[PDB]
Amino acid sequence: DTDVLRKLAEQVDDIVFISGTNGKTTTSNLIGHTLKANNIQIIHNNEGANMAAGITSAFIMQSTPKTKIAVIEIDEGSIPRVLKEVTPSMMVFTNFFRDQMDRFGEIDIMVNNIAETISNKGIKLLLNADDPFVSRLKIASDTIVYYGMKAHAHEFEQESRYCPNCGRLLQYDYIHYNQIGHYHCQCGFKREQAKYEISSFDVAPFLYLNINDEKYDMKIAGDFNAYNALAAYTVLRELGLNEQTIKNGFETYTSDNGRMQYFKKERKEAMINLAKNPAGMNASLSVGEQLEGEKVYVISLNDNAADGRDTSWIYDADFEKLSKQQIEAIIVTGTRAEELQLRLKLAEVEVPIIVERDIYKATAKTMDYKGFTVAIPNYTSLAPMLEQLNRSFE
Amino acid sequence: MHELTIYHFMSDKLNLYSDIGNIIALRQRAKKRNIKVNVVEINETEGITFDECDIFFIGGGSDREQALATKELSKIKTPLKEAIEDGMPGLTICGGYQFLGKKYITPDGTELEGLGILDFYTESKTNRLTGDIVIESDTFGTIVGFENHGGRTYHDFGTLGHVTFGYGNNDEDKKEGIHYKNLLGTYLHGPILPKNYEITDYLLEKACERKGIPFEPKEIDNEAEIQAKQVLIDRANRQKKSRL
Ligand SMILES: Nc1ncnc2c1ncn2[C@@H]1O[C@H](COP(=O)(O)OP(=O)(O)NP(=O)(O)O)[C@@H](O)[C@H]1O
Ligand SMILES: [Mg+2]
Ligand SMILES: [Zn+2]
């Protein structure tokens, strides 16, 4: 079966591996989504099964005569095992973050083992120039492509680092976050110039990227996802895709867990974002400020065991700020919809409140409005609300 | 417009029960009677005086924060008790209510000193009294809330009412909280005040007449409050019918 993978992979022209400690899945999804949005048959372990068996399984179940590109997310610790049977043409690495519970220098050791494993195989390596420990993999191929982010592209929501070439303390001209930044040892190991670079971006509420003098209007959020998008951008370009083809798929990709998850049908738009505590609610209530036009809210408050039976925390949330927004109506739902109605009355939020305790009906009701749906469930409300939203958007 | 002043004691340490919601309920009910409410947060008692106070409020903290709050409040035990004895309106929540009494006994038998304002005690047990609670009061109407406390409080004063669903102060009495003069105390969460507007209006009204300012209009719109109460009333009944 390890010979069957070897046999299956041989008939695939382009095999792209995605690895690193964080962001592999988002990166890999952006790549597979964008190719699929262009009618390119691909093998894609789109479920995150990034170990040898799951990679083997994807190849078995998805390979066809028309499958030109394999897009494979790989657990970094499985790189040696998979390389015995598959050699990729291209490999992108996102980052290498040492966790605080990791033992002494388990990172550089991991990166050496990876560099030794992939060494001298003609693999085109796509490296995060801003991560010193990804950039250390430059020693492992003669075909290196850098991506990175211009200094001051974004103000990220922020221990000490040692050079991976010579081991001396690293000097940084600028820090994006943690170890990600513009560094330069005295040994010569430095932050190299990037072939593809983000000059600036913002999150208002979704990523809006500026890559090599082109603008990408995303439908996912999260600071850190600019890097995953840029990594996916770099794969797609190196596969020969053009700005427009890449832009088409980047503009439609969305998350699927109910966290800043976007929806669209014709001109009607919605966004759903889980909030189950004062800080999560405040952030979900803020999203509407950054959306243009009238908004229609559906907010769900269940009080099941997993939610907690005490709903008093909604008084610690800043529902009063909704008065600064342009809102057609707020539908309150869940087993404790009436606490939400009463909370909003005391918030002096003077828009129509519709009490509809059935989460399904309350959520579908937002389709009756033309404004941007902002949908906010607490924990046990999420699955029914998300399911209705997928129903309503076809 | 008229003003009323709330002394909010130890708002920093005694912060476990979403006190702000009780503050909001008082601000909003008074605002519909054209009364502006100023809240004075009092976390240090040094020569504090009740001359300028219309209603006081003491929230609940953890066992450790309660004892430290009690130690700080004991610096004005006599100005406080004489204010209560003069009819000063007050609301106290969980620990802020329990430490009005003589002592609080933790589950392991540990004995914490209260203010001793009133002659009662509380003794905690590990198995908690938890759930929806529906109370029928002759002063506050139907009081509706959530309870979740290990403390069993034992006093021979008047209470917020009779418990038709839930426990109240302890396992046996089917009576909730304390009502002494204009001082209220309770174990209820929600917080208590937003749904239970007769309690909010009682305190505002007592402070209005003692100050000599009017409380008009007296009857206002309560639909949202009553709809929120009714959820718990209906569910309590269901739990009763489903226990046959
Ligand atoms: N570029 C990034 N930099 C730092 N953190 C990130 C980045 N991308 C994602 N993360 C965080 O990492 C978490 C996991 O993201 P994901 O895309 O699932 O990474 P992954 O590498 O696939 N994880 P795993 O398969 O468990 O090794 C996310 O919830 C983010 O909080
Ligand atoms: Mg993954
Ligand atoms: Zn160096």
Side-chain angles (χ1 to χ4, degrees), chain A residues 231-246 248-256:
Chain A
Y233 176 90
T234 305
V235 173
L236 298 153
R237 284 294 307 274
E238 293 299 320
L239 289 165
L241 263 83
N242 74 72
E243 287 98 324
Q244 206 56 42
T245 324
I246 295 179
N248 296 325
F250 274 26
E251 289 175 336
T252 72
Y253 176 73
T254 178
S255 76
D256 62 345

Side-chain angles (χ1 to χ4, degrees), chain A residues 24-25 48 50 73:
Chain A
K24 294 180 294 296
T25 291
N50 52 20
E73 161 182 5

Side-chain angles (χ1 to χ4, degrees), chain A residues 20-26 50 73 95 97 177 224 227-228:
Chain A
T21 49
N22 300 76
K24 294 180 294 296
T25 291
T26 305
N50 52 20
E73 161 182 5
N95 48 61
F97 298 120
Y177 66 90
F224 300 139
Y227 270 98
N228 301 327

Side-chain angles (χ1 to χ4, degrees), chain A residues 163-168 170 185 187-189:
Chain A
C163 173
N165 186 50
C166 80
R168 285 171 194 98
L170 253 191
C185 198
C187 79
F189 187 82

Side-chain angles (χ1 to χ4, degrees), chain A residues 39-40 42-65 67 69-83 86-97 99 101-102 105 107-141 143-149 151-156 160-170 172-185 187-189 191-212 214 216-227:
Chain A
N39 296 301
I40 314 194
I42 67 167
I43 299 153
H44 187 203
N45 62 339
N46 64 291
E47 71 301 16
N50 52 20
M51 282 169 148
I55 294 160
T56 292
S57 167
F59 265 90
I60 292 173
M61 305 251 285
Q62 295 181 46
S63 168
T64 76
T67 324
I69 305 165
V71 171
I72 300 308
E73 161 182 5
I74 176 161
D75 160 55
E76 42 278 43
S78 306
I79 292 179
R81 174 168 172 177
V82 181
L83 286 219
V86 187
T87 301
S89 49
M90 184 192 311
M91 184 145 35
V92 61
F93 291 89
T94 51
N95 48 61
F96 292 111
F97 298 120
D99 77 22
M101 316 283 90
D102 261 305
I107 161 81
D108 56 327
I109 295 167
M110 182 201 311
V111 172
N112 288 330
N113 289 348
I114 292 175
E116 222 143 58
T117 293
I118 65 163
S119 272
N120 61 280
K121 276 163 154 101
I123 312 183
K124 181 192 273 179
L125 302 190
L126 277 45
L127 305 176
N128 185 345
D130 295 339
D131 186 334
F133 293 101
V134 176
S135 289
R136 165 63 166 186
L137 295 172
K138 70 177 183 160
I139 69 190
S141 178
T143 309
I144 313 302
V145 169
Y146 291 105
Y147 65 97
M149 192 167 293
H152 297 280
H154 192 71
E155 220 195 310
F156 282 95
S160 211
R161 287 283 142 18
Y162 296 95
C163 173
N165 186 50
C166 80
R168 285 171 194 98
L169 182 90
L170 253 191
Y172 280 84
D173 289 343
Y174 170 85
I175 294 193
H176 293 292
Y177 66 90
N178 205 260
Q179 69 193 39
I180 307 307
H182 293 234
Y183 51 88
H184 48 66
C185 198
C187 79
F189 187 82
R191 192 280 192 179
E192 294 298 340
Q193 261 327 334
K195 179 175 187 180
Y196 311 107
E197 211 170 341
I198 290 192
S199 69
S200 64
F201 77 89
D202 49 40
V203 187
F206 299 109
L207 286 178
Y208 186 90
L209 306 169
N210 203 332
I211 302 171
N212 285 12
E214 268 310 313
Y216 296 84
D217 194 11
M218 315 280 289
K219 296 297 163 252
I220 51 170
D223 266 10
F224 300 139
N225 273 320
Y227 270 98

